[PDB]
Design a protein around this nucleic acid. Structure first.
Lengths: 196, 202
DNA sequence: AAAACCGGTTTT
DNA sequence: AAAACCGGTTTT
């Protein structure tokens, strides 16, 4: 039971960990593949600290400053070409989306992150928290687990960050493969859980 | 009856609308003198672009709400002995207003710090800061009429840390390639209008 | 102390 | 769509 998840967006160059830059509200194509209908859950969580006290503290802070209470941390596009490969789509939480797909057919979804990396601090001129796109694939534990470290920028910030990086070194590659996670028996924190 | 107020700090050196840059919490020397009798002057900090009392209080209340200390004042005067020599009856009538009495025949010097940033009025990130005004109303004892015989202001912007000096460098290096340190207060004709006061006291 | 970093914003 | 502007922050 081995899997390979793929995110297609602008990727950084060279940093020793995986890094991917995304735009707030912009949809990105995620690929699901294994080497029997299985259920996978795509989530957005923090990377540096996985303590439930601190993560929810951030989420609660972010949600309070949001203009819409209905606004979700993560969204999936209601595109028919996505709904062809998957179904039984359920939003179990504001930062979690669950759906069922088949192994024999490669699954494609479109995901957008609606929170900025800087929306967790009131400070001005600061870097901002790194985020993780975690996909759990579930027979009450996942057989496979992977994550993808990202940073979300306002407007078209993701493309600008690439330019600045390219001019740093001054003085295929658009594909990001999810990094597998060994720990399976730990539960990820969920912000405002639904569908009990 | 003519007056002259003086602020010694970093001067804009730009459009030639004089503008002066200050650091939050840093004291600056203000000079008060009359040219060709104890008089009372009030030094205040108010907004420049919009003077509606509803909006000014809206800004101040926003700033005050984000402050770590409720006792924190918009404007402060240094308890310096060389300052208390030229003035007296120092009273802080408001969080953004300080009143004191001085004599004409002796030049008055005080030390003032602004404890609010120009960007502390918006939650937004990466935007310009609001312009502020240092307004000095001078109420005469025999003239009374609850109105200043003279009025002047000084348009300023307050920067974090040593930001005021940095803004000068960027400005100095800009006009270098392409395109006195003393700032004199600009007099104001309208005297019978009342300045906005945040949390009035006394 | 001056200069570079950071990213939302604004300009072009 | 690619760079400049802005100012708090960090680095040197």
């Amino acid at each position: 039971n081995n899997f390979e998840y793929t995110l297609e967006a602008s990727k950084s160059l060279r940093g020793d960990s995986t890094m991917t830059y995304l735009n707030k509200g912009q949809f990105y194509p995620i690929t699901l593949k294994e080497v029997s209908k299985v259920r996978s859950v795509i989530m957005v969580v923090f990377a540096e600290d996985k303590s439930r006290e601190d993560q929810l503290r951030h989420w609660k802070y972010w949600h309070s400053r949001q203009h819409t209470a209905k606004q979700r941390c993560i969204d999936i596009a209601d595109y028919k070409e996505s709904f062809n490969t998957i179904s039984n789509v359920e939003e179990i939480a504001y930062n979690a989306i669950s759906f069922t797909w088949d192994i024999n057919d490669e699954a494609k979804v479109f995901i957008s992150v609606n929170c900025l990396s800087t929306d967790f601090s009131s400070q001005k001129g600061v870097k901002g928290l790194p985020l993780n796109i975690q996909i759990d694939t579930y027979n009450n534990k996942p057989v496979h687990r992977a994550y993808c470290q990202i940073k979300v920028f306002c407007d078209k910030g993701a493309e600008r960050k690439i330019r600045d990086e390219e001019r740093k070194q001054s003085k295929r590659m658009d594909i990001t493969v999810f990094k597998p996670f060994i720990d399976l028996d730990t539960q990820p924190v969920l912000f405002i859980p639904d569908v009990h």
